């Protein structure tokens, strides 16, 4: 046991006698109503450790009694965690009874070794036509999701959960790092009304970890570790192809530079911590493709003060492999999903990774979508008919391409009434290889709006008139 000597804010100091616990352990205060977990961070000498709290600190008397677990924070893990909501210490917070499982795991765990990594790049297919063609997803890589509210982001989250559990058979974890309570309640009920979570049986496809915004600054930084332990169970024990959602990554960085300033350390550049490059290192290197399975991560990125070279969105950018941006100017055009095709980049887009068939198809799409972007200004200012006859087809074809990128989702079958289509990879490359050559140009525009493959396009030209 130990005793509390000093209570200053959200920093408690504990005095032990014999069993001095190492760093990154977890203590537990005796005599209080709810669990208050302290995490050891420094050995201060004369048998005294420096702990950061994880809940409210008031009501603590100098000289109480504090036990020791002898291990780090251990959470309930398993396959029966699918469809539940937990905080950073594994407790359930939806009043549906205690989670019961066989084994536990610790959140502070080392990276995989050098002889276990994958030696080759490999594309993850998710079914969407705009994602898997122009900005494809590597297996194990980190993905950055630009865009916020009012663009249609929370549908794209709920649909990538559904398609990987269909074409690949791998579940997902959602980790809310310092997220609002009002917006972390609507995502609970939006997933219920779309089937990906289920209150009646064991066909759920996600596990929710919610460390909300009104919690102490030590408890908002470990949530992205608790929500990575669960994602490591479905790779190390079963060998699935897991996904991982963090929303967002800036509230993991910013919650780090408030523990490192409550602990009395000199700040680095503009206000961050000295250790900005290892806390991003000792988290995002556990997200990798081992020999058993993989973990892929889609992360939301908020840039402060529109500065792309601020050290919080500059440390993160060295880890990403592909970025997709949700433009609001395509949402007022009618296209869903509202993914910009020109301002998305991929690192694995390469003739020696995805082959030459994927390459020269997806290269020509972004070139033709630039010529319509340059010719749309002469038409708006000067007029229409002055341009050549070779340019009138590029105006007509690029309005066929940017509507063939639309696709009806399976998560929206109740509302918009259409059928949700999941397109494999070999249909999307075959489709755009024919639109470029003028092979299906005589058909009108609305045959291409909101279809599946290229086969269902010509079956919709017959119903017009």
């Amino acid at each position: 046991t130990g005793r509390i000597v000093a209570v200053i804010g959200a920093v408690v100091d504990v005095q032990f006698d014999e069993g001095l616990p190492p760093i990154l352990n977890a203590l537990e205060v005796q005599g209080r109503e709810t669990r208050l977990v302290l995490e050891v961070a420094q050995h201060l000498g004369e048998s005294t450790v420096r702990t950061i709290a994880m809940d409210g600190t008031e009501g603590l008397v100098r000289g109480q009694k504090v036990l020791d677990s002898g291990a780090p924070i251990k959470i309930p893990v398993g396959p029966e965690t699918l469809g539940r909501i937990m905080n950073v210490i594994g407790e359930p917070i939806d009043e549906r009874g205690p989670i019961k499982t066989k084994q536990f795991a610790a959140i502070h765990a080392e990276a995989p070794e050098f002889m276990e990594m994958s030696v080759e790049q490999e594309i993850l297919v998710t079914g969407i036509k705009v994602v898997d063609l122009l900005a494809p997803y590597a297996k194990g890589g980190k993905i950055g999701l630009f865009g916020g509210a009012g663009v249609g982001k929370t549908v794209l989250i709920m649909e990538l959960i559904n398609n990987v559990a269909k074409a690949h058979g791998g579940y997902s974890v959602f980790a809310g790092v310092g997220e609002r309570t009002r917006e972390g309640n609507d995502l609970y009920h939006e997933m219920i009304e779309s089937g990906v979570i289920n209150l009646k049986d064991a066909t759920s496809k996600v596990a929710l970890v919610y460390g909300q915004m009104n919690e102490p600054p030590g408890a908002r930084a470990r949530v992205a570790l608790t929500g990575l332990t669960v994602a490591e169970y479905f790779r190390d024990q079963e060998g699935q192809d897991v996904l991982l959602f963090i929303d967002n990554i800036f509230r993991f960085t910013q919650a780090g530079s408030e523990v490192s300033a409550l602990l009395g350390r000199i700040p680095s550049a503009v206000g961050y911590q000295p250790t900005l490059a290892t806390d991003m290192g000792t988290m995002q290197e556990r997200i990798t493709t081992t020999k058993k399975g993989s973990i892929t991560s889609v992360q939301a990125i908020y840039v402060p003060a529109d500065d792309l070279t601020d050290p919080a969105p500059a440390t993160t950018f060295a880890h990403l492999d592909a970025t997709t941006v949700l433009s609001r100017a395509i949402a007022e055009l009618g296209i869903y999903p509202a993914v910009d095709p020109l301002d998305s980049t991929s690192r694995i887009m390469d003739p020696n990774i995805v082959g030459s068939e994927h390459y020269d198809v997806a290269r020509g799409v972004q070139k033709i979508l630039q010529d319509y972007k340059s010719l749309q200004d002469i038409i708006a200012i000067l007029g229409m008919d002055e341009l050549s006859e070779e340019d009138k087809l590029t105006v007509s074809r690029a309005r066929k391409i940017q509507r063939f990128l639309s696709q009806p989702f399976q998560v929206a079958e109740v509302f918009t009434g259409h059928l949700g289509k999941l397109v494999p990879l070999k249909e999307t490359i075959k489709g755009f290889q024919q639109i470029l050559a003028g092979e299906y140009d005589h058909l009108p525009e609305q045959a291409f709006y909101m279809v599946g493959p290229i086969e269902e396009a010509v079956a919709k030209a017959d119903k017009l008139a």
């Binding site: 000597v5 000093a6 209570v7 200053i8 804010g9 959200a10 409210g56 600190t57 008031e58 009501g59 603590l60 008397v61 100098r62 000289g63 909501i85 917070i93 939806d94 009043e95 509210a149 009012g150 609002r180 309570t181 009002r182 972390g184 309640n185 609507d186 609970y188 009920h189 919610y210 909300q212 915004m213 009104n214 102490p216 600054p217 910013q254 408030e258 523990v259 300033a261 409550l262 602990l263 009395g264 350390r265 700040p267 503009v270 206000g271 402060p304 003060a305």
Partner: protein
């Protein structure tokens, strides 16, 4: 009978003896006492000195304890006796506070009499979780034609009023208190609203002018005002935001509705920074401590929309934030922006160009969206929001434009006349049924021939007409909630009858 009530109190007084857990004072200076002793004090526990001041112990150190002082330190000498009370800070709460002026600790400063509240409540409670909440659907009516049209507020949303000095941030939050009089004297129990106003570091003469403004409009019988002024001590401007949510959570816990206004939150982060750097805590950016995000987050997360199994209550929070030179990328203007839902951005340039209230609708958002508007207001303002947004694209062609297309001349013609509908005098809050009629007169096309200077005179003439001569139409949009096909034709000949003979 003045002698009898004084003799009554002193026999009714309690003169009983007790024990204590005292401890002497080591070094008093600048409002931070160091006390040796007090071996069984909890964190953030209220103690009280020998003179009569009270103190809240923030630092529990090994050999001493750091206790801030609720007063002035000229009455604290080295070698005093610091007794223990044995309880965390608690405020009186209830129905009896309605129509009173209180300080940060629940005492009465208006001199009417002491509070008769029988209940008591802590200030350090937690928010409700994810399960007892439900999505926001009911409207909170402000009474400003630009707020309810383009940036609405639901009953449980947090909306930030951000802007510079002297641009009507206090005046937007002072007619929202006045506008809820029309429901607060009626019969419908689930449409009443209760308002609380917290003044953090203003001079005493300004608060004495604002109570008289709310006494004149008969709006101090359902309002409480919590005043921690500039002269009062540095920790009393720290408790006073948390001493108002504890009075706005008694109405949320008991099935009622509420409203709270923090005026302003940028003077709480300053009164807390002084307490930190005198207790020797590690500084950070702009000498703020490491937990100023944790100071504002656990105050705004207490605003919630409860569900029917817990009562159906609500709490709505409007914080005011003063920027400096319009830079919202500072430390505290970026903490409170990322916590709340949407902002109302009042500029100073539009205030002198004639646009009053000077709400910029280019930068103002609300992320509950259109799900907090009534069915009548939603139908007309959905096109107005699209019409105004097409005008702001082409506002830079107005200074030299006559050689443009007739669509572009039309887009300028509707944008100027929709702007004149949005201007509004001070202390005149309208009704939603009168608001939807004025917008319906403009968005349809019934004003593109009237001269742009006459749009204000036409509106004050038209509103006084339909109150007296068409009262039975503004009871079939108030009670219906939506605007049907029968009322669409009935409103159609009304604005055609008035526009025909108007200029006289």
């Amino acid at each position: 009978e003045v002698s009898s009530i004084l003799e009554e109190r002193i026999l009714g007084a309690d003169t009983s003896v007790d024990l204590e857990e005292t401890g002497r004072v080591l070094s008093i200076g600048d409002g931070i006492a160091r006390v040796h002793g007090l071996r069984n004090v909890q964190a953030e526990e209220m103690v009280e000195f020998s003179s009569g001041l009270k103190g809240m112990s923030l630092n529990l150190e090994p050999d001493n304890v750091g206790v801030v002082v609720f007063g002035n330190d000229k009455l604290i000498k080295e070698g005093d006796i610091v007794k223990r009370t044995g309880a965390i800070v608690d405020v009186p709460v209830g129905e009896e506070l309605l129509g009173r002026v209180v300080d940060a600790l629940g005492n009465a400063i208006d001199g009417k009499g002491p509070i008769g509240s029988k209940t008591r409540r802590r200030v350090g409670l937690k928010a409700p979780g994810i399960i007892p909440r439900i999505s926001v659907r009911e409207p909170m009516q402000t009474g400003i034609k630009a707020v309810d049209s383009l940036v609405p507020i639901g009953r449980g949303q947090r909306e930030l009023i951000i802007g510079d000095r002297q641009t009507g941030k206090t005046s937007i939050a002072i007619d929202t208190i006045i506008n809820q009089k029309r429901f607060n004297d009626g019969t419908d129990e689930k449409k009443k609203l209760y308002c609380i106003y917290v003044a953090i570091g203003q001079k005493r003469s300004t608060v004495a002018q604002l109570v008289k403004r709310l006494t004149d409009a008969d709006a101090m019988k359902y309002t409480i005002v919590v005043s921690a002024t500039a002269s009062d001590a540095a920790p009393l401007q720290y408790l006073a935001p948390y001493s108002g949510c504890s009075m706005g959570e008694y109405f949320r816990d008991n099935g009622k509705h509420a409203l709270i206004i923090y005026d302003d939150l940028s003077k709480q982060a300053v009164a807390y920074r002084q307490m930190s750097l005198l207790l020797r805590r590690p500084p950070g950016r702009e000498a703020y401590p490491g937990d100023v995000f944790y100071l504002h987050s656990r105050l705004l997360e207490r605003a919630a929309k409860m569900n029917d199994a817990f009562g159906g209550g609500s709490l709505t929070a409007l914080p005011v934030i003063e920027t400096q030179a319009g830079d919202v990328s500072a430390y505290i203007p970026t903490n409170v922006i990322s916590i709340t839902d949407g902002q109302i951005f009042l500029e100073t340039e539009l205030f002198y160009k004639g646009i009053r209230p000077a709400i910029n609708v280019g930068l103002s958002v609300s992320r509950v969206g259109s799900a907090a508007q009534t069915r009548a207001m939603k139908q007309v303002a959905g096109t107005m929001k699209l019409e105004l947004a097409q005008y702001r694209e082409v506002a830079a062609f107005a200074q030299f434009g006559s050689d443009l297309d007739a669509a572009t001349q039309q887009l300028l013609s509707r944008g100027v006349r929709l702007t004149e509908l949005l201007k509004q005098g001070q202390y005149a809050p309208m009704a939603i049924e009168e608001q939807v009629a004025v917008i319906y007169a403009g968005v349809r096309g019934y004003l593109d021939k009237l001269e742009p200077s006459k749009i204000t005179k036409f509106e004050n003439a038209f509103l006084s007409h339909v109150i007296s001569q068409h009262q039975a139409l503004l009871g079939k949009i108030r009670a219906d909630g939506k605007i049907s096909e029968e009322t669409d034709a009935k409103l159609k000949e009304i604005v055609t009858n008035f526009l025909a003979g108007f200029e006289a």
